């Protein structure tokens, strides 16, 4: 679909706690994440294999993330990004390939976390209303207005390309929950893969680590 799903039924504007948010990573990074028991921000350490374009990642090291005066002084690279709609522009960049990675969607794994699980876990987080690197993007952690804060309607669409009258649609599709520091891996309750060999490899890794995780194979959440 859009990749905008929730844990109760379909996503609702007034119940952001049920939204499932998605973090994608290369399957070969998963043993390292297993070892640490958490997803780590880019600033923590360098990953087993990098999928992201290197100039994109260098930009995030200089992007101020500051919803409130109470929010820790921090960069985008200090956060783990979870895209609200799984089929997102950032995932397209990785899937089409570049100089640093060219594997396609095959080895990419989506780790889904419910926003309400992030909140209930007393983690520090905020939402961007679009492309986090852009200077006109805003961050917020006001739960009760998240529905109007992100472009909820666009995130639900199955078709979302830019048009002449709205060249900002892809950017708004990059709205994400940025979790400060790390995300304990037990908070992952959904795993999505593109193919069956990846899913088999993921389950052979995760069967001794955890249990109650829902596993799904969806070409539709990739490019």
């Amino acid at each position: 679909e859009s990749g905008f799903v929730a844990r109760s039924g379909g996503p609702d504007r007034k119940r952001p706690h049920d939204w499932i948010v998605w973090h994608f990573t290369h399957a070969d990074n998963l043993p390292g994440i297993i070892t640490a028991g958490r997803l780590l921000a880019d600033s923590a350490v360098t990953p087993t294999t990098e999928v992201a374009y290197n100039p994109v990642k260098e930009l995030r090291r200089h992007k101020v993330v500051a919803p409130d005066s109470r929010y820790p002084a921090s960069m985008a690279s200090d956060h783990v990004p979870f895209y609200i709609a799984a089929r997102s522009p950032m995932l397209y960049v990785v899937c089409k390939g570049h100089s640093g990675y060219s594997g396609g969607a095959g080895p990419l794994v989506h780790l889904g976390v419910a926003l309400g699980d992030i909140i209930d876990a007393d983690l520090t987080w905020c939402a961007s209303d679009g492309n986090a690197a852009a200077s006109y993007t805003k961050f917020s952690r006001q739960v009760d207005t998240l529905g109007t804060f992100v472009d909820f309607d666009l995130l639900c669409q199955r078709q979302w390309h830019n048009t002449d009258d709205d060249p900002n649609r892809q950017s708004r599709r990059a709205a994400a929950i940025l979790v400060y520091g790390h995300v304990p891996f037990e908070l992952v309750s959904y795993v999505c893969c593109y193919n069956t060999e990846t899913m088999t490899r993921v389950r052979t890794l995760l069967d001794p680590v955890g249990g109650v995780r829902k596993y799904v194979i969806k070409p539709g959440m990739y490019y």
Partner: protein, 188 residues
């Protein structure tokens, strides 16, 4: 090579690399005609002697002379305009060819205006930093027009004035997006 063509070729080369990091889902090689218009609008503001005579429009300022310049280079230093219809607002992706890249590098090495081209392009890159992409430069350019051509230097005033040209609000020409652009225009 006149220096207006050089300003074009050099804006294109550096803007593409800025955009590839900011909006990496955008095209790896093509810049839309309308983006190049916004870039040249800012270059003209940095260097009035370019004399490209911009007029305001639904997608921000537009110069017929910028389109003429791109046309004369088509199939030589640049590609992508093709053979457009007469006076239709076409927005195609335009690329620098290998010859173009070679020409602008040779140009900056020796030309009398070489430092002036770089100074204008460096000023443009600085103003648009963080606003790269087809939307960000349109937003900045439209706000700049109303701020410097219609006195619209306050948030309330500039939002109204921007939306009279764009005909659109949504989430792209809200007061908040225009406020951010206005803060940048005022700072630079």
């Amino acid at each position: 090579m006149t220096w207006g063509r050089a300003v074009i070729l050099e804006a294109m080369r550096r803007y593409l690399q800025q955009r590839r990091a900011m909006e990496p889902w955008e095209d790896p090689a093509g810049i839309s005609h309308l983006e190049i218009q916004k870039l040249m609008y800012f270059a003209n503001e940095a260097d009035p002697d370019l004399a490209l005579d911009f007029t305001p429009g639904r997608y921000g300022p537009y110069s017929e002379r910028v389109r003429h310049l791109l046309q004369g280079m088509e199939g030589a230093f640049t590609v992508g305009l093709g053979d457009g219809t007469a006076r239709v607002l076409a927005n195609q992706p335009i690329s620098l060819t290998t010859k173009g890249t070679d020409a602008i590098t040779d140009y900056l090495a020796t030309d009398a205006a070489a430092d002036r081209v770089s100074a204008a392009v460096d000023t443009v890159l600085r103003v648009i930093e963080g606003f790269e992409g087809p939307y960000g430069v349109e937003l900045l350019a439209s706000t700049h027009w109303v701020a410097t051509r219609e006195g619209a230097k306050e948030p309330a005033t500039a939002a109204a004035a921007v939306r009279k040209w764009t005909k659109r609000k949504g989430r792209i020409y809200s007061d908040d997006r225009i406020g951010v652009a206005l803060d940048r225009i005022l700072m630079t």
